């Protein structure tokens, strides 16, 4: 049976990340912009069927639903070279072009208003999936649609498919209601998502400026980095190995279980294609050292001097010509040198899977690696979000637009519950610095 993954693209950022993900998958599989396998791709080493459905004409169609409340971007996509990749009947766009107005609560109410269409789409994809593994929601926590409608869809997927994994690509902000949207999204990721991959726009901008020498990195370049990360996340699917080939195992290894689902990302190489790095054979040890380098982590975590943050778990998917003995030597040297601090209350999870790259994707690097790590310093982002929320709530800031929505017309108790959940998450992250963390919350 196929192992389908449904991609839910929410709002501008979610739809752009889904589009770039499907573009990357097409490029790795040798599929034309119309979804047709290229003649050079008949002998491909990957079966599109894992993430795409195959039409009767040998076209590979992404199992991706793109939802936006504004027509401009949908029309631009239908005018893009990739317009033929997506099934037009699988794209729902609200005719009420009023949007969520950057309000998480409004996005949630809109998800409730479009519940039937969305759950009909999810069920259609599940029935078109032989063994649907789970859903990946690509959204931003700060907008209205990507936050509210994304949380609604996460809730409904968790209720309908309580045995299926929920992975998120959650875009963290660099909107007077932004603290409310961020708190509600962090609450929903913590309570109703199995794994949240944090994509920090601040860290992505920092990397784009410092390493690609891009003056004023565009959102397009940030989304290209995001899509590269998403491809690395699917790299473990394309090469048959012995362990952790599914989204359930990926989430459990990276988001370190479902409640501890705030994920830090790491990518390598982080270099512009114009940076022809001289004739240096990248070793397994150099790969692991660069991933362990703070300048190569794609999440802006505060260097709080008070909290001794530690890694909960790390999965490194290394794609390309890799000597397993060099991988083993690199792990051994990393352990002996304690180059990474692991949780004291749980086993040090450091996995390394070696896989082959797609023959259709050009790799400048004979060996690349992505690390997905659950590391307690990710808590610094949630603490920052909590401080922003408290800064707004103490001022009753930006509440006038919330009071217009039914969920906030009488009170903000759902906001206070979300703040409580995020406080409990912060406290558990702090416990994770302690050997008793395993027993701290229970």
């Amino acid at each position: 049976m196929p192992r389908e993954i449904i991609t839910l693209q929410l709002g501008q950022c979610g739809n752009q990340i889904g589009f770039e993900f499907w573009k990357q998958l097409c490029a790795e599989h040798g599929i034309s912009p119309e979804g047709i396998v290229e003649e050079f791709a008949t002998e491909g080493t990957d079966r599109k069927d894992v993430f795409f459905y195959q039409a009767d004409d040998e076209h590979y169609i992404p199992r991706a639903v793109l939802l936006d409340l504004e027509p401009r971007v949908i029309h631009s996509i239908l005018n893009s070279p990739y317009a033929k990749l997506y099934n037009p009947e699988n794209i729902y766009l609200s005719e009420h072009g009023g949007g969520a107005g950057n309000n998480w609560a409004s996005g949630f109410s809109q998800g409730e208003k479009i519940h039937e269409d969305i759950f009909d789409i999810i069920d259609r994809e599940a029935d078109g999936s032989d063994s649907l593994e789970g859903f990946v929601l690509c959204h931003s926590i700060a907008g209205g649609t990507g936050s509210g409608l994304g949380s609604y869809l996460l809730e409904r997927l968790n209720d309908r498919y309580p045995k299926k994994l929920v992975q998120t690509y959650s875009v963290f902000p660099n909107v007077v209601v932004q603290p409310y949207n961020s708190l509600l999204t962090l609450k929903r990721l913590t309570q109703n998502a199995d794994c949240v991959v944090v994509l920090d726009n601040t860290a992505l901008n920092r990397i784009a400026t410092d390493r690609l020498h891009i003056q004023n990195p565009s959102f397009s370049q940030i989304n290209q980095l995001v899509s590269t990360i998403m491809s690395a996340s699917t790299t473990t699917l394309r090469y048959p190995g012995y362990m952790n080939n599914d989204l359930i195992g990926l989430i459990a290894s990276l988001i370190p279980t479902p409640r501890l689902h705030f994920l830090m990302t790491g990518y390598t190489p982080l270099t512009t294609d114009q940076s022809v790095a001289s004739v240096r054979k990248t070793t397994v040890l150099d790969v692991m050292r660069r991933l362990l380098q703070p300048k190569n982590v794609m999440v802006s975590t505060g260097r709080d001097r008070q909290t001794n943050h530690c890694y909960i778990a790390i999965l490194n998917i290394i794609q390309g010509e890799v000597d397993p003995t060099q991988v083993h030597k690199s792990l051994q040297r990393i352990r002996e040198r304690k180059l990474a601090n692991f949780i004291p209350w749980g086993p040090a999870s450091i996995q390394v899977a070696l896989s082959r790259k797609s023959p259709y994707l050009p790799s400048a690097h004979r060996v690349s690696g992505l690390m997905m790590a659950n590391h307690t310093s990710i808590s610094s982002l949630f603490e920052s979000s909590c401080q922003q929320y408290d800064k707004l709530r103490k001022r009753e800031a930006f509440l006038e637009q919330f009071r217009k929505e039914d969920i906030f017309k009488e009170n903000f108790d759902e906001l206070d519950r979300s703040r409580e959940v995020v406080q409990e998450l912060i406290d558990e992250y702090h416990a994770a610095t302690r050997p008793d963390y395993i027993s701290w919350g229970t």
Partner: protein, 317 residues
């Protein structure tokens, strides 16, 4: 490897060897030592040298000091006297038995033999222990940078200890600079010129043997008195730095956590160490001058000149 060119790997290995100071390294199999060496390797630029796989780790049944003393005491009346000698009274050996060997396949196995391998091992162990002592002294000096967090008139005992350890480090550094850049580079160049000129393998082996003999003589390994004096001097330097490091780290932590105690931190053994260092330096200089006048070896005049270059020991020679 043996001559410690690109010695950053040896500086990295100093810290691995420092965790083993109680018992000789021969008590532990060399597999994990080679694993640590190779895991240190890939962090330094060493890719362009396809000849370090011929290096292996041997566990000698004797430490560097003991083996040197027995070599310089054999076929002499010193063997009877120093048959009871042990490294416990002197500097303790926990990393001085580590050595490099170069096992190469036939017919290159004919070029390198165990007669040359023993000299290689002794020289490499001596160089490695001298480099460990020098790096420990430099680390002590650099860690005494937190003494600048305190006033001058509260570290007079610390000032005297620092002056004594600075003299120790300066002597060690001068010896190292002489015996590298005045001995080993010229002897390597002479050996390379002999190899590049000659073609006979037997002549190559003879040139290698003569080079090894010259290296050992310039190391003062042909005079038991000078080898014993060298061993005592470097042992007392190691002991002084080991006694320092404890309270040095203690005061460094105190200063870095806060931002008569100093006299009690300064033990009375520092003056004894200084006097012993002075005595050993004077003995080395005297024996170097005596051997230069009598034996007329080319290496002792250089050590005499390096020992007396300040205008305060040339009339004390």
């Amino acid at each position: 490897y043996f001559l410690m060119d690109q010695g950053d790997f040896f500086v990295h290995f100093m810290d691995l060897t420092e965790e083993e100071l109680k018992k000789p390294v021969d008590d532990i199999t060399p597999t994990r030592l080679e694993a640590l060496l190779e895991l240190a390797l890939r962090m330094s630029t060493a890719n362009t040298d396809p000849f370090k796989d011929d290096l292996k780790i041997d566990l000698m049944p004797h430490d560097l000091i003991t083996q040197l003393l027995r070599v310089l005491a054999i076929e002499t009346q010193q063997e009877k006297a120093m048959v009871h000698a042990d490294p416990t009274e002197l500097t303790l050996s926990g990393l001085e038995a580590f050595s490099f060997d170069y096992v190469v396949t036939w017919p290159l196995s004919l070029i390198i033999n165990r007669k040359a391998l023993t000299r290689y091992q002794m020289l490499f162990r001596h160089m490695f222990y001298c480099k460990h002592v020098e790096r420990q002294l430099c680390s002590v000096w650099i860690s005494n940078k937190a003494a600048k967090r305190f006033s001058l008139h509260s570290a007079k005992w610390f000032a005297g200890a620092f002056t004594l350890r600075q003299r120790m480090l300066n002597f060690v550094q001068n010896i190292q600079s002489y015996m590298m850049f005045e001995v080993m580079e010229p002897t390597w160049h002479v050996l390379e010129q002999n190899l590049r000129s000659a073609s006979n393998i037997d002549d190559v082996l003879g040139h290698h043997a003569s080079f090894l003999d010259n290296c050992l003589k310039d190391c003062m390994l042909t005079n038991p008195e000078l080898l014993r004096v060298f061993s005592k001097l470097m042992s007392v330097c190691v002991m002084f730095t080991n006694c320092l490091q404890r309270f040095t780290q203690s005061m460094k932590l105190d200063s870095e956590l806060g931002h008569p105690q100093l006299a009690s931190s300064f033990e009375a053994t520092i003056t004894k160490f200084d006097k012993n260092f002075s005595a050993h330096l004077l003995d080395l200089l005297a024996r170097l001058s005596i051997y230069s006048t009598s034996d007329c070896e080319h290496g002792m005049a250089s050590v005499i000149s390096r020992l007396d270059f300040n205008g305060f020991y040339t009339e004390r020679l």
